[PDB]
Amino acid sequence: AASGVATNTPTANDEEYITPVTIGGTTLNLNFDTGSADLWVFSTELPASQQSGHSVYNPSATGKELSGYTWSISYGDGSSASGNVFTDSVTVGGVTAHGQAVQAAQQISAQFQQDTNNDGLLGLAFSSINTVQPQSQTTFFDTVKSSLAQPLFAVALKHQQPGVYDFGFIDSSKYTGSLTYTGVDNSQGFWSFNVDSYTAGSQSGDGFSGIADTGTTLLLLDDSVVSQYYSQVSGAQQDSNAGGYVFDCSTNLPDFSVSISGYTATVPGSLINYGPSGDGSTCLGGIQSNSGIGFSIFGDIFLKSQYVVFDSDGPQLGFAPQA
Amino acid sequence: AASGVATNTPTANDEEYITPVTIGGTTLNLNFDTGSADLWVFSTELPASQQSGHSVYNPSATGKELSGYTWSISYGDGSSASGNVFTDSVTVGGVTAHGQAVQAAQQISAQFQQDTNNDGLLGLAFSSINTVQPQSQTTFFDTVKSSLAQPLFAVALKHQQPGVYDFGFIDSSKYTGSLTYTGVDNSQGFWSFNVDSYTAGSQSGDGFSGIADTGTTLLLLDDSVVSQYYSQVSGAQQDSNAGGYVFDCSTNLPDFSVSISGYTATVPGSLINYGPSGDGSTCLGGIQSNSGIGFSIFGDIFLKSQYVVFDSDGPQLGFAPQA
Ligand SMILES: COC(=O)[C@H](Cc1ccccc1)OP(=O)([O-])CNC(=O)[C@@H](NC(=O)Cc1cccc2ccccc12)C(C)C
Ligand SMILES: COC(=O)[C@H](Cc1ccccc1)OP(=O)([O-])CNC(=O)[C@@H](NC(=O)Cc1cccc2ccccc12)C(C)C
Ligand SMILES: *[C@H]1O[C@H](CO)[C@@H](O)[C@H](O)[C@@H]1O
Ligand SMILES: *[C@H]1O[C@H](CO)[C@@H](O)[C@H](O)[C@@H]1O
Ligand SMILES: *[C@H]1O[C@H](CO)[C@@H](O)[C@H](O)[C@@H]1O
Numbered sequence: 173a174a175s176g177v178a179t180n181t182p183t184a185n186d187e188e189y190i191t192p193v194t195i196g197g198t199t200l201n202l203n204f205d206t207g208s209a210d211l212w213v214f215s216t217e218l219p220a221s222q223q224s225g226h227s228v229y230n231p232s233a234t235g236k237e238l239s240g241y242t243w244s245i246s247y248g249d250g251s252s253a254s255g256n257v258f259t260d261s262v263t264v265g266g267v268t269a270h271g272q273a274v275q276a277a278q279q280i281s282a283q284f285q286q287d288t289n290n291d292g293l294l295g296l297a298f299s300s301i302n303t304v305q306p307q308s309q310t311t312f313f314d315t316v317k318s319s320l321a322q323p324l325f326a327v328a329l330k331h332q333q334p335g336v337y338d339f340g341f342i343d344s345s346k347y348t349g350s351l352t353y354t355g356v357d358n359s360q361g362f363w364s365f366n367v368d369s370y371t372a373g374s375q376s377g378d379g380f381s382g383i384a385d386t387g388t389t390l391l392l393l394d395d396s397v398v399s400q401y402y403s404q405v406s407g408a409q410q411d412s413n414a415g416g417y418v419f420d421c422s423t424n425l426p427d428f429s430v431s432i433s434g435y436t437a438t439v440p441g442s443l444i445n446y447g448p449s450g451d452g453s454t455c456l457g458g459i460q461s462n463s464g465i466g467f468s469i470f471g472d473i474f475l476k477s478q479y480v481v482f483d484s485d486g487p488q489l490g491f492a493p494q495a
Numbered sequence: 496a497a498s499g500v501a502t503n504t505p506t507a508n509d510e511e512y513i514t515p516v517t518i519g520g521t522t523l524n525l526n527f528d529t530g531s532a533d534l535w536v537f538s539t540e541l542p543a544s545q546q547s548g549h550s551v552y553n554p555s556a557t558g559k560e561l562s563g564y565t566w567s568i569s570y571g572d573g574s575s576a577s578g579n580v581f582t583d584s585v586t587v588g589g590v591t592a593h594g595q596a597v598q599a600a601q602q603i604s605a606q607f608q609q610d611t612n613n614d615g616l617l618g619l620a621f622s623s624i625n626t627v628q629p630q631s632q633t634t635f636f637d638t639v640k641s642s643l644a645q646p647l648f649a650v651a652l653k654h655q656q657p658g659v660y661d662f663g664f665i666d667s668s669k670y671t672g673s674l675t676y677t678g679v680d681n682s683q684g685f686w687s688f689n690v691d692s693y694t695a696g697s698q699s700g701d702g703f704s705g706i707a708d709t710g711t712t713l714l715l716l717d718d719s720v721v722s723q724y725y726s727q728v729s730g731a732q733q734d735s736n737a738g739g740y741v742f743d744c745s746t747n748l749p750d751f752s753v754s755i756s757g758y759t760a761t762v763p764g765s766l767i768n769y770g771p772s773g774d775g776s777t778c779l780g781g782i783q784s785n786s787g788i789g790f791s792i793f794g795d796i797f798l799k800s801q802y803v804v805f806d807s808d809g810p811q812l813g814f815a816p817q818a
């Protein structure tokens with residue numbers, strides 16, 4: 173049976189986490205995103221100017237084209253990309269998916285053209301939301317799932333230190349105590365779960381649902397919760413130059429916690445200080461608005477505090493504090 | 496209980512079939528497409544130059560915006576469109592869907608910018624393939640299904656004559672004999688069905704699967720079948736100026752038939768003559784290549800010969816020769 177460990181590494185300010193992935197013999201640095209289900213990469217089909225600063229996949233060398241197939245994706249942050257599709261060998265942490273659909277980029281929005289930290293994205297949401305037309309394809313995980321020792325993957329994202337993606341097994345040395353599981357609603361293709369209540373510093377409130385998303389930098393919550401949190405932070409204010417609420421870097425931030433099936437997942441205030449706002453001397457807050465979408469995005473800021481198991485049997489999510 | 500009849504009308508050469516749809520009080524002429532699951536329309540968010548020659552939806556007047564939601568779709572013919580989303584009232588044949596997601600176009604590819612025959616598309620494939628992010632929406636049919644007398648719709652597309660879409664009931668005067676049903680595989684979001692065999696003129700062959708698609712003009716089949724068919728047509732040749740095989744308009748074309756759960760659906764040779772090729776004096780064939788996609792597209796050329804019932808219970812498809 174298979175299993176493997178892929179090492180991730182945060183970019184500046186932990187904006188994104190990249191992991192090497194070998195496709196057709198060429199290694200590319202990809203952003204693993206549990207919030208989408210497409211594996212797409214920079215390719216030789218892009219204008220040469222856009223290939224600069226990246227490792228790129230050449231479909232002609234090893235891929236098998238799916239004639240007539242296309243893909244087009246749009247992300248929450250407004251970026252988008254589109255292209256054609258080939259199948260090829262894809263290896264992640266020593267685990268190889270043969271015949272995996274690789275979506276070759278033919279067009280990419282400005283955001284991707286500016287970001288040289290990654291060469292594409294590897295989706296780990298459920299395959300039901302993969303964008304390939306006319307027939308959708310399975311994610312790397314769904315492709316290899318049956319060959320793994322256990323049909324799960326787990327992640328430990330860290331602050332300014334390498335972390336890991338464990339495939340097919342749980343590394344108990346990565347967390348303290350025992351895991352607590354909660355059921356996942358995959359009806360929208362996400363690893364969605366319910367929280368029974370939350371505590372933002374000195375204020376507590378009722379529950380809501382949200383998704384475990386390695387692909388989102390921040391913890392995005394309802395505006396009422398965001399307001400409630402920052403009302404407690406001395407001098408915090410919105411700064412559109414920075415992208416949201418900012419505050420003096422030396423400010424003491426309250427913790428934020430959520431109750432999930434009896435387990436209290438706590439994000440310490442120190443992790444909520446994301447980093448320099450990039451607008452003078454303030455710091456950007458790790459908690460920001462979810463834009464009114466009706467559900468919360470448990471992004472990297474939250475994930476940095478937990479070891480999380482994505483289990484296809486259930487499906488369900490397991491949580492424990494990172495060691 | 497509800498039911499209704501919407502009248503469709505073919506454009507020149509039956510290239511597409513349009514039906515009026517009222518959204519927020521404004522009537523737009525839409526192409527009903529059982530091959531996709533998005534209801535999208537020309538809107539005031541498009542460049543003014545692109546609104547010319549169309550009826551357009553103004554979301555500001557009656558729609559409720561879904562903040563943070565987007566959609567992006569790509570069709571088999573290479574066209575694409577993208578935009579934002581609002582919910583509004585949508586009436587088709589006297590049947591009203593309240594709170595229906597209407598996808599307002601913000602960008603449209605050249606193909607749509609050139610086509611003034613329609614003001615958008617109304618998808619009737621299964622909702623599982625709707626493109627709205629972050630949470631997909633239901634098609635008009637899925638929205639109203641529970642209020643209909645029976646959870647089905649049926650279609651009679653005709654050659655150069657108005658046809659109908661029946662919602663929630665079967666009009667037995669539209670076909671001869673009794674309907675024959677066959678099971679539908681909706682795993683890819685299509686009304687997909689199996690044929691046990693086919694006969695192309697004097698040649699018969701083994702089965703394959705395909706989708707019932709009102710949104711595709713032609714009958715798209717595997718290249719081997721296309722070759723087999725045209726090998727029987729005196730002087731037929733490919734003409735890229737026309738888009739596929741062409742032949743002298745006076746040529747006698749063989750019939751094409753498929754066996755579906757014991758019923759023989761026959762497309763007469765006269766219906767396979769699509770019309771003037773638009774390249775001199777030849778005629779374009781109704782049968783053309785499916786581009787190697789691995790399944791057949793039973794488009795309008797085939798549908799013109801049958802009355803077809805799309806039944807959500809099963810699901811299943813019913814067929815009988817049009818009256
Ligand atoms: C399924 O979730 C998404 O698609 C998510 C969440 C979402 C969904 C719907 C609406 C809005 C957001 O977007 P996405 O996958 O595009 C998520 N993108 C990001 O997190 C990008 N990051 C950043 O952009 C850093 C960042 C900096 C400053 C302010 C921010 C305010 C909100 C979120 C991120 C901010 C990537 C560069 C890492
Ligand atoms: C789910 O099916 C689709 O998305 C289908 C079929 C498909 C799928 C995959 C690959 C190729 C094709 O494309 P679509 O929905 O874009 C289907 N488009 C059409 O039928 C367009 N029509 C025409 O373009 C007329 C037409 C003229 C000349 C040659 C043709 C050769 C093939 C098909 C149509 C031809 C629209 C103007 C009506
Ligand atoms: C992951 O688990 C597999 C199956 O037990 C091992 O073979 C592998 O070495 C790694 O520990
Ligand atoms: C990535 O790198 C880390 C640390 O270098 C290892 O722990 C892991 O096995 C993988 O090789
Ligand atoms: C469609 O069917 C409904 C329910 O029987 C009728 O009320 C309607 O007039 C139409 O015949």
Ligand SMILES: *[C@H]1O[C@H](CO)[C@@H](O)[C@H](O)[C@@H]1O
Pocket residue numbers: 500501502503657
């Ligand atoms: C569309 O128009 C046809 C014929 O004009 C009618 O049969 C149908 O009821 C609908 O009004």
